[PDB]
Design a protein around this nucleic acid. Structure first.
Length: 51
DNA sequence: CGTTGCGGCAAAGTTATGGGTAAAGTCACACGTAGTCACCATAATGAAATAAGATCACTACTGGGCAGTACCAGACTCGAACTGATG
């Protein structure tokens, strides 16, 4: 919720295209109790350049 | 005393013993005495042998695991489509 509202101005399509993951997985991560894969987690972290 | 036998006294006589001195005997110098088996215990090896030890080979007995098979879901991911806000 923080990262989408920080640089993606509350949108998921830009974030999904930036990280390449389909938007369905983005919605699953951001809305339900679905834990993103570790590779996906730290790829998002690298996109944010934060540990 | 007058005579006769007996006994003491003190040289005198006879044996014995440890010394000295000339003189008849005595005997080694003659190449020669050391020299040679017999003897049985102890060290001392070197060989004979060990008594056990070392390993091979076989026979039988008994633990016991690996490549592979199989199901029942839970959970994340995402084609494919639905549907609402918008410039």
């Amino acid at each position: 919720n923080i990262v989408i509202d920080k640089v993606a101005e509350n949108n998921a399509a830009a974030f999904s295209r930036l990280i390449g993951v389909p938007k369905n997985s983005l919605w699953m991560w951001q809305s339900t109790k679905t834990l993103p894969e570790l590779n996906t987690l730290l790829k998002i972290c690298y996109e944010l350049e934060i540990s």
